[PDB]
Design an enzyme around this catalytic site. Structure first.
Site, short mmCIF file in Angstrom:
data_model
loop_
_atom_site.label_atom_id
_atom_site.label_comp_id
_atom_site.label_asym_id
_atom_site.label_seq_id
_atom_site.Cartn_x
_atom_site.Cartn_y
_atom_site.Cartn_z
N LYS A 3 5.01 3.46 -1.77
CA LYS A 3 4.76 4.84 -2.14
C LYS A 3 5.01 5.00 -3.63
O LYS A 3 5.89 4.35 -4.20
CB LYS A 3 5.63 5.81 -1.34
CG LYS A 3 5.55 7.28 -1.77
CD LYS A 3 4.14 7.86 -1.61
CE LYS A 3 3.72 7.92 -0.15
NZ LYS A 3 2.96 9.16 0.16
N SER A 38 -8.66 4.08 5.37
CA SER A 38 -8.40 3.49 4.06
C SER A 38 -8.44 1.97 4.13
O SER A 38 -8.98 1.31 3.23
CB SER A 38 -7.05 3.97 3.53
OG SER A 38 -6.00 3.11 3.96
N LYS A 90 0.85 -1.18 0.00
CA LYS A 90 0.00 0.00 0.00
C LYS A 90 0.89 1.24 0.00
O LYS A 90 2.03 1.20 0.46
CB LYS A 90 -0.94 0.01 1.21
CG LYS A 90 -2.22 0.83 1.03
CD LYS A 90 -2.09 2.25 1.58
CE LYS A 90 -3.44 2.82 1.95
NZ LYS A 90 -3.35 4.23 2.40
N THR A 102 -8.59 11.33 10.74
CA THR A 102 -7.48 11.85 11.55
C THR A 102 -8.00 12.45 12.85
O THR A 102 -7.41 12.24 13.92
CB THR A 102 -6.69 12.88 10.75
OG1 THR A 102 -6.36 12.35 9.47
CG2 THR A 102 -5.41 13.26 11.49
N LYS A 138 4.13 2.93 9.67
CA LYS A 138 2.74 3.20 10.05
C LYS A 138 1.92 1.92 10.07
O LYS A 138 1.18 1.65 11.03
CB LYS A 138 2.12 4.21 9.08
CG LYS A 138 2.20 5.66 9.52
CD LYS A 138 1.12 6.48 8.82
CE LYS A 138 1.09 7.91 9.32
NZ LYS A 138 2.20 8.72 8.76
N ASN A 185 -9.50 20.96 8.38
CA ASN A 185 -10.53 19.96 8.65
C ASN A 185 -10.20 19.17 9.91
O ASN A 185 -11.08 18.89 10.73
CB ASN A 185 -10.70 19.04 7.45
CG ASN A 185 -9.65 17.95 7.38
OD1 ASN A 185 -8.49 18.17 7.72
ND2 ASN A 185 -10.05 16.76 6.95
#
Lengths: 234, 410, 410, 410, 410, 117
Positions: free
Chosen positions: B102, B344, B66, B186, B90, B217
């Site tokens: 990535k 995700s 991913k 988040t 992560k 946000n």
């Protein structure tokens, strides 16, 4: 058309005092039309005010009455409105920062598209304005909602139209053809550093201004050392 | 320039603390599959310019890889590899079946146009379709990337594979089969982490003083969640300044007046700079703004008991050391900002299952995952006398190294 | 409107003459897989118009299917099916491993632009990529289609399949892996057929009088081949008229002065219309021009011993009957104009083998195939008291019906 | 003859009300992939007859396609396309990841025999195996089709793909991996819809007068569910008449005496025709019987506050207009009869997951989906001053059009 | 260090001479797919060391890619890319359907053992099996690589693909399905090239004086072929010196006494160094020995009319300029040493066809290909006033650039 | 599209812009078509348009890279033809004259066939 006097007497004092700098002994210089020295189109336009039949309302003390909310996008069916009149971007101030302008340009939402129109000319101002109208109408037919009038990418062969004239021409053409409500005209012109220029642009149609030249000047001054305050705060 | 070396050094430190041999370090220092491609593209004027692509799979021992995709004009191989390792860390921290990766493209979305971006993304997928698939890779949204690009990528992979694969790519629009709450992930993650940190440190959440600098946000949703929970907010800041009120700030009114950008400062009123905002009294401080803010000068001025680095490395080593000496809990950013990755993953699971959950179910699952991960890392960091950043890195690398050892590559 | 019914009637006649049951007719009257698709396309102005596609596989019992693609604005399903059956008949006559098929798109190449045609073809392949492949289908050049479109189609199928497949599509450019002689295939086929017909009828090719009306690439190459062989040409015609000389016409000079269009008539000289050209004395007549030329009025005026219909159905039933009564050999167009299909098959074989032959080898193989096919059909047509058109249709349908019977679909 | 035109007109109306451009209408008017095939078959006597097949995928932008299969001797391409669009509308209304489709075969199950039907289905799958798969298509039971045919189709697809694919086809027997409650899905859906409609209109379900004309499996299960819930049934009808009792009818006894056909009328007792049954006093009326029953004459005689069209278009436009003027809630059949599609979707999800749920879980999930869909459509139909049929069509088309716009085909 | 820059500069020169735009240069400067992998390996002692792998596909527009594999301990990415471009140039010059590529592993075959090399190769294939296949890549023998490694690679690819693929990899043993003459391919190529060069320059091959410095397999086979043809050899050299005899040297006796290494010098006899050997009178000179031999000092001393650089760049730019000024034909090494590539291509074709040719057929096909290529390059180099090296580079790049333009990547 | 609405100078400048853009892209043949002409768009005199294009191309040094084909309805006399060739047109396609001949042949006059005519 920048000047060292203009910089050191209009830009630094704004940051220093938190307000537009003051003065006395009001202008006595000859009008732009009579002045031999080349002058930008902005000097030809003089502000107006209210004398009788209405008072000049105050701002600082009467802040509760003011409203600086600006809407970007396309309006919907006024007579039967439902949720698409309000599916739009709304701003708090007409002016924009570099990050904000880049975010608006990069927004790729299908309903809120973005188009960039090169406001430049070579020899014929009429040809330039007609070409700009052609790009505008083609983009509207495609379905855009935001137009970006940019003076960048300007070289010795392509010169910029006076931004006030270009914005006024675009606004009048859009109003005449009945498509202004479907678009939003954002303006990115270097010659935008005075509140007079800003107010002229908003009054004559510009949805937002991105004084990239002023921001770059502040970056240069901060790099040199003057104006010690940070770039973002400035 | 130093990102790759710093990543390698921290990985080496974590592996040394674990005590594994140097073979795991040798294998994990470098991504196992880096691909460089050239994408032909047609501009509006008809001219053709070639964009340089990238793609890196740090490891796939755990399972499918991913990673995000950034259309950043300064993307390079070193940055791509560093980000791949960071994403792998992560995933290891959150305990997901992902390995890490990535991608990126060397372009300028600013001067790029709408149809040209469409063609660019489509050429990118046509280029890297060979090593990308449901059991091999999974793109996701990132810098200069969002739902429209995700949808175009999904549409094209459907075209090339001849069958629908909604689970191929995450971060899709809701109608296309997206997951609810994709924007508040988040904020929810940081809300869970702050709640658990306050519980562990004994600070009562009810009436806790909170400061949230950076009102995008993430900041807006975090403030709303704190207000709903009960904790009072005694400070907000944005690009135009901030405010201060020891007895609340009417978060409901602030959110009601919130504009598109999140700017909230008045016009004819003085504002407080973030430098002085950091010094204001508060129980918990949440820097979610420009990086490199907490340094030596303000380390002695900070007063919050709990500091959560929702942003990417807002602090420095000196500030971390000073805070550790002062005994101020410091939440690593790797755990603070994992809500996006978690949501995700939930979206991918929903697509694979073919059935879509609801907001309440997503809320419950996300909070369960976050609380479990935070409790595990806190327990490990208290068992071993180390910093929470070191504990996070160590925990993240543990799963990857151990899975590699099982699979026998070493 | 009547093309499909006429094809069905001729197929029924051929099957009845063979004596097979009605099940083969029931199966072969209709193509077994017709697909209609809609291809999104982006124009230069940015507007999107949807083009309707088509694809038909008449049969695949023998093996992989084949067919052309016409960008004709009046293409319809009936025409597509009729052309698929016609191509299947061609393949059966030539004894190829192809079954037959045809594709098409409803568009206007005239108003269409270059990049727009590129995008149109690419969308067409993305649409019909599922049922098309090396062992399932093989596009080929046709009306409003040529090497550039073939190359774009090849490039895209390479992209979608992730591996090079030069043999996927025929009629590619020479550099891409094409076959030499792709332009003179029809001329070579008609040259072999005229030679064999003259040999069988006893007409000596040396000094044989020949008329070639229609001076495109086919006419020019046929005239050059006849001159090389030895036969004298005593007539040529084009869009601007014709000529006449009983003792040769200097074909070398005519080809040297040949322009792009093939026009050869002088400027200040009177010309001969094709109507009177047909009546000129000659041993062999080769109508390769506008259709519906040989009819009742000129049937009694025709004088050639051998008539070769290089064009598509230039004659009519009444003219065919009159010629048969007069005992004038009539070469069916199905066999006359199979050079293109034969060279396309050779190109496919070369791509599949991965090794490219030479002009001499292609020449030898093509002439061998053509002479064998012509001898077989001539023998069958003399064994059975029928017309050569009926013999061609019967021979073509024999292989397809017999292969279906073996494979057991009936 | 008018089914396709009516479907196109209603789709055009829905798109116009939405306000999308005409490109979506151009794309959605016609299915994107229609295949016609011929299936060889061997009869008991040894003779071979060829059956004409069909298959249509209206759209697959959302994901895998779905559709039933009817062995109706009058199935034609127009009907197949109309049914494909109708199934797509059903899927859009229920908010499933399906696009829509339909298949069919021209045959007569009446004169067809058992082994011959087996061979027919097997030949059908061998014919259309190319464009059918777990991520491309999903057959389902329909007219003249049931569990045995589903099982044969599953067995053959397992044979051809060489690996077990229970999720390939829905409506399988319980032992093969079916889902419980496959027979009461329609009854459960109508029960949820009637409950929600009564709640929204304020009619108390307790003691509500109900009439259920048409006492097949749907009617029987609906009556049993109403009795369990608490509402009293004051009328039942079947092929042999009906009954009437204002104070209940002992639904338990009626179901106990229920025969194979569902006939319940006595022998030596007079019965009530459906025409007069419709006029009987009642709160909710449920026509689940022959179509074209509610018309102008009985529109002024109808008295129920809520009318649920469990059947397929039992009413007409004039009756709909009269009921709307009288302010009588009219449940669209598209939403009333979606229980079968919903249970088929649940069965597919269970097969894909490999774990089988229970009756209670299926009950809860089905009621949740139905209540959510009904609430959404009711809210939209009250927000916009339109009929509930128009609201249903509009909601169904919204998802398909929006997904197509995301995927960029337009 | 300068290999990549030199390759880019020569490619730029060739493209500029062709006149194509800069887009082709931008695309062709860099390989389109470079993969770096890490191969776990188990040593005899049980310890595990990780070897770094490489693989580069310069282009695949023409079709499947090809490249060797060198186990050279100093292999790096720059060298791999340069060799990939060089192999692509070879393929373009020889007019093969290959695009070009190269692989490598960072290891030391010297200290490596037998079973360890087996495991190393097997791990390499397990690592890069994804982007390698019959229609994607084709390994071949190279430095520190031979038939045993080819056989192991073939065996493993058979294992992983579950079906036999003899054509997957070239250079296999004869029993495994190799091609005859795999060892004399370079000698045959240089023999054809020398024959054609002598014919074009008018030098009679009969009695032509020849010098062959470097007496490995290439030198031995070249001497034998020259003797068979008729030309006299008046000089041989090896690692231990050389000889000299103006009237022949009994090549039959020299080959009979040839040892494993090819050393032929006597023991108690003085020998001639290569520096003075180069100056000996002769018609054709064939440097097939250490590189950097022909330089400024010996440029004025060279006397041969034809110089063939069978080795890799034995000369320098100054020597090339001096020879061109002196009007001495200089055969580029790219064309001189293409026999290995040609025989590998023939082996691949034989495997794909499944039928094996004979020595005579291989001889005829190889000589035909070589003579055609040499004639084409000679004609082009005489048409354009340039050096033969520039002509070779230009011809090689022409096919690749033109195929890319057809496929539309630019 | 050789058409204009109000400003002949604007029309000619726009035509020059299309020409130079196409040359930059790499075209070699230009088609000046008067078709697709309605009540709002009127045709420039073909002689004037061709002369302007030819002069602009010669001045900018790109005429050798292109070929100007002209398709104008007002081309039926040898005088008009010769003017067009002399002032730059590479070829003429009198589609209007061909359509007129088609109409006459359909009506009955000029019995000769369409292709021969």
């Amino acid at each position: 058309g920048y000047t060292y006097e203009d910089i050191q007497k209009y830009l630094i004092p704004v940051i220093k005092e938190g307000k537009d700098p003051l003065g006395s002994m009001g202008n006595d210089a000859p009008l732009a039309v009579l002045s031999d020295r080349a002058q930008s189109l902005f000097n030809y336009f003089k502000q107006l005010f209210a004398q009788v039949t209405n008072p000049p309302i105050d701002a600082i003390r009467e802040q509760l009455v003011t409203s600086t909310m600006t809407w970007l996008g396309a309006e919907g069916d006024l007579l039967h409105p439902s949720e698409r009149n309000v599916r739009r971007i709304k701003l708090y101030t007409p002016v924009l920062s570099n990050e904000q302008f880049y975010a608006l340009k990069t927004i790729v939402h299908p309903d809120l598209k973005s188009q960039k129109i090169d406001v430049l000319f070579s020899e014929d101002l009429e040809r330039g304005l007609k070409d700009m109208f052609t790009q505008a109408e083609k983009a509207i037919s495609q379905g855009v909602s935001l137009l970006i009038l940019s003076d960048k990418k300007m070289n010795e062969r392509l010169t910029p139209i006076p931004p006030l004239l270009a914005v006024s021409a675009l606004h009048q053409h859009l109003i005449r053809k009945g498509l202004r409500t479907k678009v939003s005209i954002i303006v990115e012109s270097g010659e935008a550093r005075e509140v007079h220029h800003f107010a002229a642009l908003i009054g004559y149609g510009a949805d937002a201004i991105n004084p990239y030249l002023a921001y770059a000047t502040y970056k240069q001054e901060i790099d040199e050392g003057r104006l010690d305050i940070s770039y973002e705060e400035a | 320039l130093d990102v790759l070396k710093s990543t390698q050094t921290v990985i080496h430190k974590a592996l040394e603390k674990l005590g594994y041999p140097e073979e795991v370090y040798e294998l994990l220092k470098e991504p196992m599959r880096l691909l460089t491609v050239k994408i032909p593209v047609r501009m509006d004027d008809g001219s053709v310019k070639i964009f340089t692509g990238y793609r890196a799979q740090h490891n796939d021992s755990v399972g499918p890889t991913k990673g995000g995709i950034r259309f950043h004009p300064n993307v390079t191989e070193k940055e791509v590899k560093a980000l791949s390792i960071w994403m792998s860390l992560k995933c290891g921290i959150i305990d997901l079946p992902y390995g890490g990766g990535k991608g990126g493209i060397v372009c300028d979305p600013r001067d790029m146009s709408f149809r040209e971006l469409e063609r660019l993304s489509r050429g990118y997928v046509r280029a890297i379709s060979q090593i990308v698939g449901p059991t091999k890779d999974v793109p996701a949204p990132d810098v200069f990337t969002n739902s429209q690009i995700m949808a175009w990528m999904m549409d094209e992979y459907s075209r090339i594979d001849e069958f629908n694969s909604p689970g191929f790519i995450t971060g899709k629009p809701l109608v296309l089969g997206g997951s609810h709450g994709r924007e508040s992930a988040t904020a929810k993650g940081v809300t869970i982490c702050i709640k658990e940190a306050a519980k562990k440190r004994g600070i009562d959440i009810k009436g806790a003083r909170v400061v949230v600098q950076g009102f995008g946000n993430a900041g807006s949703y975090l403030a709303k969640f704190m207000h709903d929970a009960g904790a009072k907010v005694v400070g907000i800041s944005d690009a135009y300044g901030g405010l201060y009120d020891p007895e609340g700030l009417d978060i409901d009114y602030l959110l009601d007046r919130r504009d598109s950008f999140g700017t909230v400062t008045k016009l004819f009123n003085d504002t407080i700079t973030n430098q002085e905002l950091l010094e204001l009294d508060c129980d918990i401080l949440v820097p979610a703004a420009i990086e490199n803010q907490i340094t030596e000068e303000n380390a002695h001025n900070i007063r919050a008991k709990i500091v959560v680095e929702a942003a990417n490395g807002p602090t420095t080593l000196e500030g971390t050391k000073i805070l550790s000496d002062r005994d101020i809990l410091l939440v690593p950013d790797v755990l603070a900002s994992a809500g996006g990755v978690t949501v995700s993953y939930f979206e991918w699971v929903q697509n694979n299952q073919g059935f879509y959950w609801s907001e309440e179910e997503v809320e419950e699952k996300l909070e369960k995952m976050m609380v479990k991960s935070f409790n595990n890392i806190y327990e490990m960091a208290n068992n071993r006398r180390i910093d929470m950043r070191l504990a996070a890195y160590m925990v993240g690398v543990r799963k990857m190294a151990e899975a590699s050892r099982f699979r026998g590559w070493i």
